[PDB]
């Protein structure tokens, strides 16, 4: 759902606050092919340390679920860049899948990624997502077998997101190689990129898109509301401008 060779920033909603998040998005938009906006959760057990700490900051500063929809709505007033909402199942489940997907679509969200979606709910979920007009994004880690990658690809309408278990490990490159051999959908990778050579290498190996999350959120946790300029400089470095 994004142009080939795209850089895809990931940011946690409400880190440090909802207004700063919006400011960050508007500043990175000109370099982004797509954007992943993460919804804070008290137990981000599938994320690395840097991202977990961002969820904690956002929640500590008093983030509210609906504020995520506010961010996207406001962003939609200035841009059409594809937005993928990333979230754990508890929030959506506790609010009602249909209700959630509907309001998400209403706000301007294009796709959704449910990190810990129970496998025996995937079918139902994909059904409703389609009905509500929301594209699905599913993730695959290095221990995902070829057979499962195929199933995931068949249920995916947005893109397949490849992530690392927790510079770039050979196991991550292996996952990408295998994925490009199986998936008809475009693939984006979130392998913990931090330098220009990472982006060059991953694109050369077939990644349609490269997500940049921890490298950006680390700056935010350090500069807070004043991270804007440093975020642009980091993306610029990764783009090799």
Curated annotation (Swiss-Prot):
Pathway: Amino-acid biosynthesis; L-tryptophan biosynthesis; L-tryptophan from chorismate: step 5/5. It catalyses: (1S,2R)-1-C-(indol-3-yl)glycerol 3-phosphate + L-serine = D-glyceraldehyde 3-phosphate + L-tryptophan + H2O. The keyword Transferase does not apply. GO terms for cellular component: cytosol. Keywords: Amino-acid biosynthesis, Aromatic amino acid biosynthesis, Lyase, Tryptophan biosynthesis. GO terms for molecular function: tryptophan synthase activity. Its EC number is 4.2.1.20. SUPFAM superfamilies: Ribulose-phoshate binding barrel. HAMAP family: Trp_synth_alpha. Tetramer of two alpha and two beta chains. Belongs to the TrpA family. The alpha subunit is responsible for the aldol cleavage of indoleglycerol phosphate to indole and glyceraldehyde 3-phosphate. This is Tryptophan synthase alpha chain. It comes from Pyrococcus furiosus (strain ATCC 43587 / DSM 3638 / JCM 8422 / Vc1). The gene is trpA.
């Amino acid at each position: 759902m994004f142009k080939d060779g795209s850089l895809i920033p990931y940011l946690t909603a409400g880190d440090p606050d909802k207004q700063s998040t919006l400011n960050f998005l508007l500043a990175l938009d000109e370099y982004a092919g797509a954007i992943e906006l993460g919804i804070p959760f008290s137990d981000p057990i599938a994320d690395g340390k840097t991202i977990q700490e961002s969820h904690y900051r956002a929640l500590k500063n008093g983030f509210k679920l609906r504020e995520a929809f506010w961010i996207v709505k406001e962003f939609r007033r200035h841009s059409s860049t594809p937005i993928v909402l990333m979230t754990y199942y508890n929030p959506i489940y506790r609010a009602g899948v249909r209700n959630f997907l509907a309001e998400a679509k209403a706000s301007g969200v294009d796709g959704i990624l449910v990190v810990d979606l129970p496998v025996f709910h995937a079918k139902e979920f994909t059904e409703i997502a389609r009905e509500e007009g929301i594209k699905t994004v599913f993730l695959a880690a290095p221990n995902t077998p070829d057979e499962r990658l195929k199933v995931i690809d068949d249920m995916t309408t947005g893109f397949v997101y490849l992530v690392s278990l927790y510079e770039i490990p050979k196991t991550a490159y292996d996952l990408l190689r295998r994925a490009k051999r199986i998936c008809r959908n475009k693939v984006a990778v979130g392998f913990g990129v931090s330098k220009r050579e990472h982006v060059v290498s991953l694109l050369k190996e077939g990644a349609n898109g490269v997500v940049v999350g921890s490298a950006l959120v680390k700056i935010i946790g350090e500069k807070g509301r004043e991270a804007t300029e440093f975020l642009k400089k980091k993306v610029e470095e990764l783009l090799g401008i």
